């Protein structure tokens, strides 16, 4: 695994292997609210997820992923800036080494403690995730800023599952879960054209960033950081952080739905 988040293989070094790191549509960004453009043409975000599409949780070494069956349109995102239906395939989190930072997106310079990514691919235009992932209109990702405070009970199934995937490569079934339960009450959002926030950093993402945060406790964040990046039997290496710094807007417009 050439890339990671440590001093030698981390975000400031990704450009050596992935020159798109220094591109014009890189994510995440700082959303400066004085510079957002309210767009009257934005429709409300519509999510409709079937809990039976939940499939598997996986320790991928730098993070963990919760994957969904994506063979049909049982679980879809519509509305907002999109004409096309986008098919749910994954959610995951980013976090930092301490409570002070850990989100990827920031709002008016303010860093949150963690961030939820709910990822979808354009099944109107493309035939698979692998095809869509490199296309400018291929991916739609909802970002939710997670503010340290009260324990969030909606995270329970996810946190309880981590003990079965402690080390790199471990995976387990993760079923009967609707991740719309993790979204805030308001789906008021910012949107901008951007990228995956880690390699391969493709500029394929329409970002949908929620205005409203969701909560997370200090102890729930500790559960994320207690996951191990090493394989079973090796020296324990906690997953301390996996958030990328904010990237230059390079003249992009962040639009507001509100
Ligand atoms: N950084 C990143 C990478 C991927 C991956 Cl691992 C692929 Cl192999 Cl496409 C994906 S995804 N949704 O897994 O295709 C999303 C992101 S993110 N953090 O939401 O921008
Ligand atoms: Zn992410």
Author numbering: 3 to 260
From the paper:
Carbonic anhydrases (EC 4.2.1.1) are widespread metallo­enzymes that can be clustered into eight families according to their amino-acid characteristics and differences in their active centers. They are present in all living organisms, catalyzing the hydration of carbon dioxide to bicarbonate and a proton. Clorsulon is an anthelmintic drug that is clinically used against Fasciola hepatica. For this purpose, the inhibitory activity and isoform selectivity of clorsulon was studied using human CA I and S. mansoni CA, revealing different modes of binding of clorsulon that explain its inhibitory potency against the two enzymes.
Human CAs were better inhibited by AAZ, whereas clorsulon displayed an inferior affinity for hCA I (K i = 4516 nM) with respect to hCA II, IX and XII. After the initial rounds of refinement of the complex of clorsulon and hCA I, the calculated F o − F c map showed clear electron density inside the active site compatible with the inhibitor. Cl atoms were introduced into the model with zero occupancy due to the fact that there was scarce electron density around this portion of the molecule. Clorsulon contains two sulfonamide groups and it is interesting to note that the sulfonamide which interacts directly with the zinc ion is that in position 3. This choice was probably due to steric hindrance by the trichlorovinyl moiety in position 6. The amino group in position 4 formed two hydrogen bonds to the side chains of Thr199 and His200, whereas the second sulfonamide moiety interacted with the side chain of Gln92 and established a water bridge to His94. On the other hand, regarding the hydrophobic interactions, the aromatic ring of clorsulon showed a connection to Leu198. Indeed, His200 in hCA I reduces the space available for the clorsulon tail and forces the second sulfonamide moiety (which is bulkier than the amino group) to move towards Gln92 (Gln115 in SmCA).
